[PDB]
Amino acid sequence: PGIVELPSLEDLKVQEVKVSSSVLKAAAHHYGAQCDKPNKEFMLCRWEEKDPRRCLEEGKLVNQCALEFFRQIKRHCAEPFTEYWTCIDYSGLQLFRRCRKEQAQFDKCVLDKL
C-alpha cells in the first residue's frame, strides 16, 4: 500500500521541559490555571485530528507556554517552590496531604508576587 508520512527529525526539535514528575505535580494546579488555552487547543486538536502528525505545532506551543510558566515561577518564587517540591518529592505515592504548609507558603508567595 502507501508509504506512511512521517515528519523529519528537525521538525520535532523543541526545548523540552526537563524537570521531574514531582516538580510537575507540585506546580500542577497553577499550571492548569495559567496554561489553559494552549493546552486546550492542543487536546481539542488531538481529539479532533486523531493524529499526532497534525498536532505538532500546537504541541510546540504547549511546550513553549509550559517553559514560560516555569520561567515566571523561577524569577520570583524559586526557593519556596523548591521547598515545596522537595517535600512532594520525598513521598512514595507523592501525596499532597503530607505537604500543606509548604503548599500554603508557595500559594501565598505566588498569590502575592505573581
Binding site: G32, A33, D36, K37, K40, M43, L44, W47, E48
Partner: protein, 80 residues
C-alpha cells in the same frame, strides 16, 4: 409477632441478628438522605480527561477557563 420474636431470640440469637442486619442493609439505603451524595461524588471523580468542546459560538453554559464561574462546581463536596 411479639412472643414468637422473643422465643426465637431465646433459641437462635445468631440468626435473629443475621436477619435483622440483612433487613437493615436492604431497606436502609432507600430511607437515607445521604444516598444521593454517593452518586454525586462517583459522577464527579475525574478519571478521564475533560475533552474540550469546539466553541461554536452559542454556549452560555460551558466555561472558557476552568476558574470561570459558569460550569459544574464542587462547593457542596467541599462543604457537605
Amino acid at each position: 409477632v411479639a412472643a414468637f420474636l422473643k422465643n426465637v431470640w431465646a433459641k437462635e440469637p445468631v440468626l435473629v441478628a443475621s436477619f435483622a442486619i440483612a433487613g437493615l442493609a436492604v431497606i436502609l439505603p432507600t430511607l437515607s438522605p445521604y444516598t444521593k451524595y454517593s452518586l454525586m461524588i462517583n459522577r464527579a471523580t475525574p478519571y478521564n480527561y475533560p475533552v474540550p468542546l469546539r466553541d461554536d459560538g452559542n454556549m452560555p453554559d460551558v466555561p472558557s477557563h476552568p476558574q470561570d464561574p459558569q460550569g459544574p462546581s464542587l462547593e457542596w463536596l467541599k462543604r457537605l
